Design an enzyme around this catalytic site. Sequence first.
Site, mmCIF file in Angstrom:
data_model
loop_
_atom_site.group_PDB
_atom_site.id
_atom_site.type_symbol
_atom_site.label_atom_id
_atom_site.label_comp_id
_atom_site.label_asym_id
_atom_site.label_seq_id
_atom_site.Cartn_x
_atom_site.Cartn_y
_atom_site.Cartn_z
ATOM 1 N N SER A 268 -3.853 1.316 -4.204
ATOM 2 C CA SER A 268 -3.375 -0.015 -3.816
ATOM 3 C C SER A 268 -4.500 -1.033 -3.642
ATOM 4 O O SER A 268 -4.246 -2.141 -3.200
ATOM 5 C CB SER A 268 -2.560 0.044 -2.506
ATOM 6 N N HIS B 189 1.175 5.389 -1.977
ATOM 7 C CA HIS B 189 1.680 6.695 -1.549
ATOM 8 C C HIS B 189 2.909 7.266 -2.234
ATOM 9 O O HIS B 189 2.922 8.429 -2.634
ATOM 10 C CB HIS B 189 1.988 6.645 -0.036
ATOM 11 N N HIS C 237 0.835 -1.221 0.000
ATOM 12 C CA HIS C 237 0.000 0.000 0.000
ATOM 13 C C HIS C 237 0.861 1.259 0.000
ATOM 14 O O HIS C 237 0.588 2.212 -0.723
ATOM 15 C CB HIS C 237 -0.930 0.038 1.219
ATOM 16 N N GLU D 72 -5.581 9.753 0.900
ATOM 17 C CA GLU D 72 -5.863 8.311 0.896
ATOM 18 C C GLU D 72 -6.970 7.898 -0.091
ATOM 19 O O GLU D 72 -6.880 6.819 -0.689
ATOM 20 C CB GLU D 72 -6.200 7.827 2.321
#
Length: 288
Positions: A230, A171, A166, A211
């Site tokens: 993700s 990110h 993830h 996010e």
Amino acid sequence: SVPWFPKKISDLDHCANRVLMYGDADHPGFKDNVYRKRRKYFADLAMNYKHGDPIPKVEFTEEEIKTWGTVFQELNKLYPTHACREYLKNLPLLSKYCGYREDNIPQLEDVSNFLKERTGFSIRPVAGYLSPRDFLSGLAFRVFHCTQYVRHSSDPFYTPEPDTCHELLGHVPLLAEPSFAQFSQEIGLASLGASEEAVQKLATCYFFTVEFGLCKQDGQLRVFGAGLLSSISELKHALSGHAKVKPFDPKITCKQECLITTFQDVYFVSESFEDAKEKMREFTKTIK
Ligand SMILES: CCc1nc(C)ccc1OCC(=O)N1CCc2nc3n(c2[C@@H]1c1ccc(Cl)cc1F)CCCC3
Ligand SMILES: [Fe+3]
């Protein structure tokens, strides 16, 4: 009085170890002893890390690398039509300099050096879940707290817990973009020593941008939120016609509930990273 907050990047040593570590009854690796020991191994590396250390490099197991490969292969089929232009620009650089490949999990230390060069962002390994306040405070110093372990191999599609897949695929490519790095740092800066209410509001704005954010680019909707980038199924869901979308608007967005065990109820669309940044600047004035 103002609550304790970090004044320099090494002050993160004092909060980055305040975490909820693994052991989660319904977690897929819960009854797996080898996995439990492995998660302890990763947790200890994070707990013992101090600012200034190189981030310990890890030899990932064949099983871990296959899990990564499975996730990596499906998401890459989707990125060209789903990810924002900034993400697509940066991902190939990561492949070339940090070893992003189906058969190789990148090292946090290499990714950290790449980001330090590009935007001054850096990585700090994190043992478990931090408070919103501590997590945001790292952003003020361009520090992103990153998990280093891999999800259990039994379910390569298990996402409600962030793992290194993830972090690295969701990110990192955006943190290498200057406009995005500036946007993120300014959430962190605003949070420093702020009230509990202010921290909640900033954490929610963060959630629905960094996010789970969407953006509009050349009239089309794309994805920039790490949690979507993700997550194979929600990435598809978000750009399908079935999702509910609203304009990013901090005074509205900050009231929205943040969901973890299911798809979001709603997604917020930012015009651009520069615009989201301007909107937050106006918003932060109102929460002192
Ligand atoms: C400011 C981010 C944050 N918000 C809250 C409400 C709690 C903690 C927190 O920071 C540390 C943390 O637990 N998270 C931040 C990094 C992260 N990335 C993801 N996730 C997190 C995680 C986090 C946990 C719970 C909630 Cl409500 C939000 C989160 F961002 C969760 C699953 C999708 C991908
Ligand atoms: Fe995340």
